Ligand binder design. Structure first.
Ligand SMILES: Nc1ccccc1Nc1ccc(C(=O)c2ccccc2)cc1
Ligand SMILES: CCCCCCCCO[C@@H]1O[C@H](CO)[C@@H](O)[C@H](O)[C@H]1O
Ligand SMILES: CCCCCCCCO[C@@H]1O[C@H](CO)[C@@H](O)[C@H](O)[C@H]1O
Length: 345
């Protein structure tokens, strides 16, 4: 049953993977692990293999490992990262120290294919459609991404797109704040799912114009540039702000009106402009949802209400728990062992 493993060293780190994975080649890394391209001899497809970095170093790393594995085991949608395989070279819990995750290799992300460049209107429709199709699914399981940015959006040669949990922050050969909802930067501590729609708006704008929509130098500059486009908060939004200091500061600003978006995005498909107007609203309760956005006329050539599925319910109850490092490790180990690969279809 247990496959036979082999060892090699890659960028000062040891990789121990089953023989089925061949021609490991680094493609990059992030805060939580390093990623290699490989050939999967079982399917004949190319895969991405992520080795998590120091998965059980602290209580927080351990819980973060468990969270990532539990999440990735639940995602089963064409526009969301899915797990082909999860393995460890350990034969038992006592020696369990390394965790590797496997997904379909995409080969690029939207940090790249922007090229700092204009994409055509039809390419924008298709890419933003797939993003929203993925988010409808994610949001239906009451998961909010919260950190959407071009690097989270993996794209293959067919322009097929998947949302990653974490992309490559470094590529073996773009500020995150640029894509953040204003409520995130104000530390609201309670979020709507439409925090992610804000980010989509930012990405859609950039693809249509070739320019970063709000290239702030910091969170304060970021908000300054946002208010410039969308205007200062209205009385209706103001009613909903409990924070006295946030309210007092906002009300003390030289008040500004919402710009005419048609003027800002001159030349763009008016349907795209209309959709941008419905994503980029300060008040998160008035932003369009992923489900509503799919049914916007902009996506008429793609929208299929019978092929935009929702997710099985997802149990996030472990988030409220405070466990020992060996308990998170053991729970993660149980998840490695219970893993059922998808069919080769
Ligand atoms: N997050 C995670 C979880 C489990 C396994 C892997 C990952 N992470 C990635 C998945 C796919 C890719 C790419 O296909 C890619 C993107 C940009 C450039 C080259 C290739 C990159 C990272
Ligand atoms: C599979 C697609 C859904 C992915 C949902 C989780 C995306 C990552 O979630 C991010 O994790 C970070 C580190 O833990 C946190 O600091 C961020 O607040 C959070 O947005
Ligand atoms: C310059 C600062 C203005 C930013 C105002 C952001 C308002 C975001 O919108 C708020 O989102 C909350 C969820 O986080 C909801 O609870 C509120 O009902 C909603 O109005």
């Amino acid at each position: 049953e247990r496959p036979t493993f082999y060892r090699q060293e890659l960028n000062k780190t040891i990789w121990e993977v089953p023989e089925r994975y061949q021609n490991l080649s680094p493609v990059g890394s992030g805060a939580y692990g390093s990623v290699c391209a490989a050939f999967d001899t079982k399917t004949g497809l190319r895969v991405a293999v992520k080795k998590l970095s120091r998965p059980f170093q602290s209580i927080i790393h351990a819980k973060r490992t468990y969270r990532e594995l539990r999440l990735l085991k639940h995602m089963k949608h064409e526009n969301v990262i899915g797990l082909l395989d999860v393995f460890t070279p350990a034969r038992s819990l006592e020696e369990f120290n390394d965790v590797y995750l496997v997904t379909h290799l995409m080969g690029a992300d939207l940090n790249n294919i922007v090229k700092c460049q204009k994409l055509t209107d039809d390419h924008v429709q298709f890419l933003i459609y797939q993003i929203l199709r993925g988010l409808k699914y994610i949001h239906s399981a009451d998961i909010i991404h919260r950190d959407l940015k071009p690097s989270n959006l993996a794209v293959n040669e067919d322009c097929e797109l998947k949302i990653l949990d974490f992309g490559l922050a470094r590529h073996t050969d773009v500020a995150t704040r640029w894509y953040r909802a204003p409520e995130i930067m104000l530390n609201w501590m309670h979020y709507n799912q439409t925090v992610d729609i804000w980010s989509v708006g930012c990405i859609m704008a950039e693809l249509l114009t070739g320019r970063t929509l709000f290239p702030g130098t910091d969170h304060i500059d970021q908000l300054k540039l946002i208010l410039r486009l969308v205007g200062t908060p209205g009385a209706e939004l103001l009613k909903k702000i409990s924070s006295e200091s946030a309210r007092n500061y906002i009300q003390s600003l030289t008040q500004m009106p919402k710009m005419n978006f048609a003027n800002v995005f001159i030349g763009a498909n008016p349907l795209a402009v209309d959709l941008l107007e419905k994503m980029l609203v300060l008040d998160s309760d008035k932003r369009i949802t992923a489900a509503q956005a799919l049914a916007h006329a902009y996506f008429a050539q793609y929208h299929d209400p019978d092929d935009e599925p929702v997710a099985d319910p997802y149990d996030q109850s472990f988030e409220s728990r405070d466990l020992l490092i060996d308990e998170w490790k053991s729970l993660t180990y149980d998840e490695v062992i219970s893993f059922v690969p998808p069919p080769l279809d």
